[PDB]
Amino acid sequence: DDPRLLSLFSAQREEDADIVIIGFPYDEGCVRNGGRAGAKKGPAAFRFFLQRLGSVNNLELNVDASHLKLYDAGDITASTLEEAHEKLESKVFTVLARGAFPFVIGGGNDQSAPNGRAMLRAFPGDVGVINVDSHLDVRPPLSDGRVHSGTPFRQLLEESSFSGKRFVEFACQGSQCGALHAQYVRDHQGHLMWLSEVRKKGAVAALEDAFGLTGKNTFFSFDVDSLKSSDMPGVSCPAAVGLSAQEAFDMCFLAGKTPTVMMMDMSELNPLVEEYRSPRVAVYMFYHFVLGFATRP
């Protein structure tokens, strides 16, 4: 007598679904970036609470998502991290190509590079990207060329088909972001929206501004370590300060109802660090996105 998210998984075939969930159970990217392992367990933890949470008809927000059809495409499987990237990008692109909405649960933030490449191919020369993250993630590769959880947006800014003017680093933190990396983003004409500015404007208002810059066909990329660890402790790099759970929910809801947002990912959920509260927040974030999506034209 209380239908929740699980009740929306009514599509017998993937192609019938409005939103397709794809899992990326890898954290080698995190370890390469010197982070704590654990994010490979994120998708499993997310699914666990995906089965339990989120009233489909939300009378507080006045949104009924009963009409949406969700499908779980399972995890990307590969013998190397780099092959996993290839298969993830390919999977995401196919979902985009038929006009469905792919949501990717990680796993390390390195997932965002393949995800971004899927976008750039689905909407040639017309893509926008926002990285919600306390960190810029424009670090160089490892000396042997290897990519990691800290390089995905350097990889995307280096794409010739992508305009940096439409890249926003959202809720980034000056205490954690280097002058060189700030310069790199800004020299690509990308935008830095510091945490303090987000809080001064209000999270939703600032995100609206961000969506104004990202424009059409926006990749909404959410590193959950942008949330204060008081709400979101289960990540490799716990934030002392950052977005609240409510700000996160409110932001995801906006993303959902914003017609230009064409895909979303969520990185850095680490059940080894904390396994109950954090995955629940991650699921509620997706839930708020689903509600917002329910309202879009």
Residues 58-87 that bind its own copies (CB under 8 A): 58-61, 64
**Cα 229 from chain centre:** 17
2 binds its own copies (CB under 8 A): yes
265 binds Mn ion (CB under 5 A): no
Which region, judged by CB under 8 A, interacts with its own copies, from 39-47, 56-64, 108-116, 254-262?
A: 56-64
**Using an 8 Å Cβ cutoff, are 175 and 140 in contact?**
no
Structure token digits, residue 41? 């367990």
The contacts found for 213-216 with CB under 8 angstroms, 24 or more apart, are: 213/128, 213/165, 213/166, 213/168, 214/128, 214/129, 214/130, 214/166, 214/167, 214/168, 214/260, 215/128, 215/166, 215/260, 216/123, 216/126, 216/127, 216/128, 216/260
**Using an 8 Å Cβ cutoff, are 207 and 256 in contact?**
no
Q: Which helix (H) or strand (E) holds 20?
A: strand 19-24
Binding mask 91-110 for Mn ion (x = CB under 5 A): ------------------x-
Judged by CB under 5 A, the number of residues near Mn ion is 6
Q: How far apart are the C-alpha atoms of 297 and 86, rounded to whole Å? A: 32
Which partner, Mn ion, its own copies, none, binds residue 229 by CB below 5 to 8 Å per kind?
its own copies
CB nearer its own copies, residue 67 or residue 179 = 179
Structure token digits, residue 293? 């999506």
Binding mask 12-51 for its own copies (x = CB under 8 A): ----------------------------------------
Residues 24-43 that bind Mn ion (CB under 5 A): none
Structure token digits, residue 29? 């990217």
148 binds its own copies (CB under 8 A): no
155 binds Mn ion (CB under 5 A): no
Q: What share of the chain is helix, strand, coil (3-state, %, to 5)?
A: 45, 20, 40
Q: Which residue ranges make up the site for its own copies (CB under 8 A)?
A: 1-3, 53-55, 57-61, 64, 139-140, 172-182, 192, 194-196, 228-231, 233, 238, 240-241, 244-246, 249, 276-277, 280-281, 284, 287-288
Residue ranges for the known binding site are: 109, 133, 135, 137, 223, 225
Q: Which residue ranges make up the site for Mn ion (CB under 5 A)?
A: 109, 133, 135, 137, 223, 225
